[PDB]
Design a protein around this ligand. Structure first.
Ligand SMILES: [Cl-]
Ligand SMILES: [Cl-]
Ligand SMILES: [Zn+2]
Ligand SMILES: [Zn+2]
Lengths: 21, 30, 30, 21, 30, 21, 30, 21, 30, 21, 30, 21
């Protein structure tokens, strides 16, 4: 998931934004 | 913006900045 | 433990500490 | 909500567990 | 995204997030 | 400057990019 | 509460949250 | 010690509480 | 260096920075 | 104590070394 | 003071503490 | 540079001070 992706690879702020309420 | 390498609590900090008053959900695997 | 004021990024850092793998929601609108 | 309980007022680590999934 | 108050160490953590490899300057005197 | 724009007032992530190199 | 994996300054943050106004001592090996 | 244990393995908040004053 | 206000978690992060391996005590009651 | 010296008032990095072990 | 092992955002925190109101520039390679 | 040195090896506060404005 995002938690793993950001840590093992990289992720963008745009991907993070998907987790906002 | 640039791509991010974020582990642990740094991911939560990033979500906090990105989401602001909307808040967010933190859902790790397992 | 104790009771303190936990605000903003400090609040979500505390949620991360407390919840960890369970995950959590931060929903300031409520 | 959480902001009122833990920032505006004061909350314990146990109360913070209220917002875990 | 959102607009919030970002002060002190939180401001430079946000600059780090936003700028990353580009680098940044924090120049509070202005 | 940045302190006035983002701490004293309120700024977006886009405005913060103003201070990138 | 969940178990913690805490290195560096993250350990100090955790101690701060756990101990509150009691404060704490940070004593690494060597 | 606790500093090393939390980092090389895992530790609990209850173990941390032992380091409060 | 400089003089600033260092409070709460920021104060203990600064102690960690300054003291490191020596270790430190944070004793707000005094 | 440290809170009065460094939070309420203002302290240097050198003064913070006062609280090292 | 002690020597520091600082990665990511922890370097920015350290620069913030060290430089205070002077501010600082963060300039990673590449 | 300093960013890499602090992370791959170690660095001092005195070296960091060189990056202040
Ligand atoms: Cl604050
Ligand atoms: Cl880390
Ligand atoms: Zn970290
Ligand atoms: Zn803060």
């Amino acid at each position: 998931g995002i938690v793993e992706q950001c840590c093992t690879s990289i992720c963008s702020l745009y991907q993070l934004e998907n987790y906002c309420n | 913006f640039v791509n991010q390498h974020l582990c642990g609590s740094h991911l939560v900090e990033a979500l906090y900045l990105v989401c602001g008053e909307r808040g967010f959900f933190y859902t790790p695997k397992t």
